[PDB]
């Protein structure tokens, strides 16, 4: 069923499949800033399952495999959500509508500035690539399916293959866009480049996460086969 | 004369960049004493310390890496120093499975990395880099192209000189995909097979991000040593 749709019916497919916007728990310290990020954080998990168990290709592996390639990306991808919202808000973090925060913010939690930093340059970057939409799920399906591939074969082969669908699709819109030849590999190539800096903010994430909790692979498991 | 980055054809920027390739280095142990008598992190820290050197040279050959200020070039170089060791080991690591190569003398299989802890865990991502670069049969004017990205974008997101930077990554991309043309890919197939190599950069820094770690927690190359390195070129005989 995965493999056979069009580049539209992709697009669709992830357009529909998209976690709702969640508020924030209805001035602040560092214990009021890391509970309501928690919370926040908590509610998104959820949501994230029942958007991975949508994209095309990822019911087709086994339980293990969902809850390893989970386990590795969930940071990435509440990340790249963050940073998708947060592209008109320039010097803000869009957390939820009621929850955007700037960098003095940041500073409330020893270390956290970094991270808020790095955040805020990365959203400052695909606004002026003037990422879009339809774009953006696609990238946020290749971290799922990315993110913990080398770290796990037949089925390596079929993530492979929904991993090269999602650069035709990525292709695809950027021909309806009127992009030339040369400009659709170029514009390919930066959005998976700063593929690489959300590798590098969740590696950071988790050092600081560490440095205090994270979702263990039995609660991945269980909301897993909850759904 | 001189050349600039965004002058250079395809054939031009693949030359540059084998030309610019650094020698293979041999360990530092003499080969009568058993391997018994000698530290695992000893060797590697010692073949790290002298791949650096090498290093700097092969950075101002990058087509664009010069035209930045001292200030930027130090900055790209500390952000990415290790994945550049690490990608040059998982090349040289393809045709010897299950084993890493850091050196001709120094061929390590896992079994070996457990001595020393938390090394583990980097060996066998190390070693699934290099199969999976092998799986794709990765190239050595692919590789070069490869190094050259990690260089430029490891450190771009941590003004106009950015435009320089990504017109630059342009220009390799570029290289890249004549590269695909000239072997005789479909358009599909070049953009999917690139799409396959940009992944594996992500997979680099997540080693990298580990292989930092790991350092922290015991010598990492200070801003100021390396910025002391890339002064210090300017004295050396060309
Ligand atoms: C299981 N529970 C998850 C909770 N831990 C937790 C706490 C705080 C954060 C927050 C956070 C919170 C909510 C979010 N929504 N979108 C993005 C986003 C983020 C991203 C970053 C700024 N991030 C900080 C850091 F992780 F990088 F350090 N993320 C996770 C334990
Ligand atoms: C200039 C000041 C001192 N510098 C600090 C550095 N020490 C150091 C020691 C060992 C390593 C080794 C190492 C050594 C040699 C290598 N060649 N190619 C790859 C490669 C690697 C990659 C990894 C396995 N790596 C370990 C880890 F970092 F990932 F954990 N890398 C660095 C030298």
């Given at each position: 069923?995965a493999?056979s749709?069009?580049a539209?019916q ?10 709702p916007?969640?508020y924030?728990?209805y001035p ?12 926040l ?14 994209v095309?290709?990822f ?7 969902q809850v390893?390639?989970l386990?590795?990306?969930?940071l990435?991808?509440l990340?790249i959500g963050?940073?998708?919202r947060?592209?008109?808000h320039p010097?803000?973090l ?5 929850l955007?925060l700037?960098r003095?913010?940041?500073?409330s939690?020893?270390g956290?500035?970094?991270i ?6 990365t959203?400052?970057?695909?606004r002026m690539?003037?990422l879009?939409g339809e774009?953006?799920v696609?990238?946020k399906?290749?971290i799922?399916?990315?993110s ?6 037949e089925?390596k082969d079929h ?5 090269d ?9 950027m021909?309806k866009?009127?992009?030339?030849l040369?400009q659709?590999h ?5 959005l ?5 800096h959300?590798?590098?903010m969740?590696?950071?994430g ?6 205090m ?5 039995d ?7 909850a759904?």
């Open positions: 069923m493999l749709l069009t539209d992709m697009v669709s497919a992830l357009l529909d499949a998209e976690p916007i969640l924030s728990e602040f310290s560092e214990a009021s800033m890391m509970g309501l990020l928690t919370n954080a908590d509610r998104e998990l959820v949501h994230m399952i029942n958007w991975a168990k949508r095309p290709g019911v087709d592996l086994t339980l293990h495999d390893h390639l386990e590795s990306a969930w990435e991808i990340m963050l940073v998708w947060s592209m008109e010097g803000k869009l957390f939820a509508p009621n955007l700037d003095n913010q940041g500073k939690v020893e956290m500035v970094e808020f930093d790095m955040l805020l340059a959203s400052s970057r695909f690539m003037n879009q774009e953006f696609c990238l399906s290749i799922l399916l990315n913990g591939v080398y770290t796990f074969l089925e993530i492979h293959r929904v991993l669908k999602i650069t035709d699709t990525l292709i695809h819109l021909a866009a009127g992009l030339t040369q659709q170029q514009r390919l190539a930066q998976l480049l700063i593929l690489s959300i590798r590098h969740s590696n950071k988790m050092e600081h996460l560490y440095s909790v994270v979702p263990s692979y609660l991945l498991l269980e909301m897993l086969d759904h």
